[PDB]
Amino acid sequence: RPTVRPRNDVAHKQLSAFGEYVAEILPKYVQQVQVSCFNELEICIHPDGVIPVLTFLRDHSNAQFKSLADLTAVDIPTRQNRFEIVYNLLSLRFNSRIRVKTYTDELTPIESSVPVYKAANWYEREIWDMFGVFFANHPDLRRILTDYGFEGHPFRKDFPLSGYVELRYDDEVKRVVAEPVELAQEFRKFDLNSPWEAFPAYRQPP
């Protein structure tokens, strides 16, 4: 292969050492599942303790991460437990990227990452906005990307793309901008999904 392959695996075995090192501590409180693919590491964490996992990787003699920078969340209705809050972490001294995930349904409150990371509070507001996941012991939980008179949570797959309150008229009332009107133009639902399985090995037995 010359153009077909992106990069050959060489650091994959080196990154697999981290998949053993953190797992050598072996907590049922923390570890659970460790996944490593395409020069990247992924860890999912039990809901009971998220803060003790985040205090780890911060400082530490073997690996120095410090920056718990970017913070995402996954909406998926397949599992019994719905949401999956995903932390993307980066090291400056070590130069590596590791991932921290949560497995809980988190309609019930989850522990905040504000005491460990300063910029985490702004991302925590977005998760409460789009997904509707409350963070316990959080300072200033305020709406950012949502409207001031917005109902529900705008991202959830349970409701449509257009929404319920979206169209804003002016018409009859001199100053009051309208809200209750719900109709919008037709978004064409594409049913484009290819027959036959796309890739081998990814197939799971029923």
Partner: protein, 106 residues
Amino acid sequence: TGLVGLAVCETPHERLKILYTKILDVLGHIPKNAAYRKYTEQITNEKLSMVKAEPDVKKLEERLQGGQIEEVILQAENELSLARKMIQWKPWEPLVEEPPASQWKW
């Protein structure tokens, strides 16, 4: 001479030696059977030998840091806070928490 960061580059030796000797005792208070104490100690003992051998050389600062003594002192300063938090909240010593539901593949 001053470091680029906000932390002031102060000419202080053995300051790194005090903090690294302090954290070893804290680890030997509550966890003993846990692997957290068994693995962190051998890295710290390896680093302490480099300080004792090299007298105020930039090569000693270049070992596993390479951003002068000011960056290495910050690594020791938060080490005591990380060890005390690990001693207070039991996670390394005890493992008994419930397992997740069987689903992972997307």
